[PDB]
């Protein structure tokens, strides 16, 4: 439990806080997809007792990344839903964090809360990103346009290039949102949520698509504008 991955979720000060779930197995599952997502995408907007957990766990992942050991590689590989993000974790973080020993992840409490419930929102980041390869100049103040587009880049940083093996993966993942069966999934989702009924979900005949070709031919345009 002193081992810098394996988690102890209590309320006593020696233990990192347990966030509410169904089972400690469920806590582990949740934690795993949170860490996976944070490694994939440096920030997580995360409510509750979950965020400090993410902070500590991210620090653990960076510690493992600094280990740079085959046992470390393997133990991080046990932990994540993504194998690929493990490779990302051992390519990026050492150069990123070579000058820091302590507190690698920044937690920022947001003044907005879920409408759904009173639970507060925390903004969890990795620290210095000007040393990162693929996250170099990115802007997180607002989201991207359609969520499969690469996120905003700061105006002064436009001309940045990213590791090819990452935008290959990202484009392969984003390329299934342009096929029309995703559009059918989208409309059918409207139908479903409307049936379970959830307010402010428009009728599936009003739901005009996320992806069109005109928007693609302008998006790719500005994407090579960033390149």
């Amino acid at each position: 439990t002193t081992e810098p991955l394996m988690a102890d979720y209590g309320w006593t000060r020696g233990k990192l806080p347990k966030f509410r779930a169904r089972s400690p197995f469920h806590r582990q599952q949740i934690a795993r997809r949170m860490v996976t997502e944070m490694i994939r995408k440096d920030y997580c907007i995360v409510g509750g007792a979950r965020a400090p957990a993410l902070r500590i766990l991210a620090d653990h992942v960076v510690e493992l990344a600094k280990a740079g050991d085959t046992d470390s590689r393997q133990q991080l590989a046990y932990f994540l839903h993504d194998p690929l993000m493990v490779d990302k974790a051992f390519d990026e973080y050492p150069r990123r964090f070579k000058d820091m020993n302590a507190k690698y992840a920044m937690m920022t409490r947001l003044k907005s809360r879920r409408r759904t419930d009173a639970v507060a929102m925390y903004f969890v980041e990795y620290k210095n990103r000007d040393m990162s390869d693929n996250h170099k100049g990115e802007d997180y103040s607002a989201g991207p346009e359609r969520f499969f587009l690469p996120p905003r880049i700061v105006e002064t940083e436009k001309g940045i290039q990213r590791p090819p093996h990452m935008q290959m993966a990202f484009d392969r993942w984003a390329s299934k949102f342009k096929t029309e069966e995703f559009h059918h999934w989208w409309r059918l989702r409207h139908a479903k949520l409307r049936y379970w009924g959830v307010r402010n979900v428009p009728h599936p005949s009003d739901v005009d698509p996320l992806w069109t070709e005109k928007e693609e031919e302008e998006w790719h345009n500005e994407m090579l504008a960033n390149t």
Partner: peptide
Amino acid sequence: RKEHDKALGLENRKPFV
């Protein structure tokens, strides 16, 4: 200039932003 002209006389690292 002289160094690119040495490179060119014989005829990546930081990307231009």
